[PDB]
Ligand binder design. Structure first.
Ligand SMILES: Cc1cc2nc3c(=O)[nH]c(=O)nc-3n(C[C@H](O)[C@H](O)[C@H](O)COP(=O)(O)O)c2cc1C
Ligand SMILES: Cn1nc(O)c(C(=O)Nc2c(F)c(F)c(-c3ccccc3)c(F)c2F)n1
Ligand SMILES: O=C(O)c1cc(=O)[nH]c(=O)[nH]1
Ligand SMILES: [Cl-]
Ligand SMILES: [Cl-]
Ligand SMILES: [Cl-]
Length: 350
């Protein structure tokens, strides 16, 4: 479309030339929350997973709406599901600024926000203000996830996550915990017990979100514990602390997590491995460097039932959401799939 080209070639490069990345993100949150925003979802794109219907498989990844300020605007942008957070138990400021950096030559970002969070109570009251509106959205195929963090100074990480389950679990369709083997088992056992203690109408799925930076041994151990405990899904992946050869941006050596195109295929290969190690029985939300329908379908074919993006929104703006969905629909037809569902995991059946 013309909007896609105008955002990508003119408006976004101009905003990014005028505004540092944190200011630009804050402006994005404000515009989105007001619905100040520039594709028809077809039956082909619907996915049923995690106990819910998803009208389309393209979600906004954690971190864009850390405090739950823009959920309704994010649905208006075209996302099939929204994940807010990470939310920590107590409010905390996060790292000193600047704490996020653009790598324009790489179509990448590095960030070290450090879990800046309004905290559980503020977010709880924010979501309560729209709780029934969300119930209707979810029923109509637009679910809500809540990503749970821990405070920097916490001495008992499992208890921080347990608090998040109790406070925000009743308002979410799924919860996310970001992640020796016995220590992971202890943590997830406690999270699942707290989840099971909520009333059935307020009882969310629980997913584990992993980094792309894990050893083979770590991945094997996670797959084992996830299957043993009955964890509902995996989110694959967070940003990378690696720095692939070939980054050109002047800021490539800043501390933090790298996202965007240089992360893309590390993430896809991590999806592929986790799908295999769980025998395709554990739903995966695939995330990392998704900017096109091809990127989305590669992750779906590798094992993802849903995908998310963030960094592509920061470079290309709101039209990228409809772009990904249109390209994904077109590729699915070209490859002979009846819908997203038939493509999930398809590379493993070659
Ligand atoms: C500025 C920024 C902040 C983020 N904060 C969070 C967060 O609070 N919790 C989380 O699980 N992931 C966070 N992420 C990771 C994203 O959810 C996602 O896993 C990662 O960026 C890869 O997707 P992308 O390449 O499409 O950006 C953040 C990413 C960015 C760029
Ligand atoms: C690291 N980093 N760098 C950036 O420029 C951003 C960001 O969020 N940009 C950003 C922006 F500046 C916008 F104006 C919209 C935006 C939002 C609503 C309507 C129009 C434009 C946006 F989606 C964005 F992602 N993050
Ligand atoms: O807040 C952050 O720094 C943050 C959290 C997270 O989970 N991933 C990321 O890239 N940054
Ligand atoms: Cl920058
Ligand atoms: Cl360097
Ligand atoms: Cl680092």
């Amino acid at each position: 479309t013309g909007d896609e080209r105008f955002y990508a070639e003119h408006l976004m490069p101009t905003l990014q030339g005028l505004l540092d990345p944190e200011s630009a993100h804050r402006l994005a949150v404000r515009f989105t929350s007001l619905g100040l925003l520039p594709f028809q979802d077809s039956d082909m794109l619907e996915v049923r997973v995690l106990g819910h219907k998803f009208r389309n498989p393209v979600g906004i990844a954690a971190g864009f709406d850390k405090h739950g300020e823009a959920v309704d605007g994010l649905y208006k942008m075209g996302f099939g599901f929204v994940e807010i957070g990470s939310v920590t138990p107590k409010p905390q400021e996060g790292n000193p600024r600047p704490r996020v950096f653009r790598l324009p030559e790489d179509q990448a970002v590095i960030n070290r926000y450090g879990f800046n969070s309004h905290g559980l109570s503020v977010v709880e009251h924010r979501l309560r203000a729209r709780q029934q509106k969300q119930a209707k959205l979810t029923e109509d195929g637009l679910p809500l996830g809540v990503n749970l963090g821990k405070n920097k100074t916490s001495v008992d990480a499992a208890e921080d996550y347990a608090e998040g389950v109790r406070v925000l679990g009743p308002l979410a369709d799924y919860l996310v915990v970001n992640v020796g083997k016995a220590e992971l088992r202890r943590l997830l056992t406690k999270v699942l017990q707290e989840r099971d203690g909520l009333r059935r109408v307020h009882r969310p799925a629980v997913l584990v979100k992993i980094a792309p930076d894990l050893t083979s041994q770590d991945k094997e151990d996670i797959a084992s514990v996830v299957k043993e405990l009955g964890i509902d899904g995996l989110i694959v992946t967070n940003t990378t602390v690696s720095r692939p050869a070939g980054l050109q941006g002047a800021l490539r050596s800043e501390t933090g997590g790298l996202s965007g195109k240089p992360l893309r295929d590390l993430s896809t290969q991590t999806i592929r491995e986790m799908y295999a190690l769980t025998q395709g029985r554990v739903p995966i939300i695939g995330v990392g460097g998704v900017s096109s329908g091809q990127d989305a379908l590669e992750k779906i074919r590798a094992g993802a039932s849903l995908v998310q993006l963030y960094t592509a929104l920061t470079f290309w703006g709101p039209p990228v959401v409809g772009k990904v969905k249109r390209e994904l629909e077109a590729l699915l037809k070209e490859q002979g799939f009846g819908g997203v569902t038939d493509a999930i995991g398809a590379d493993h059946r070659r």
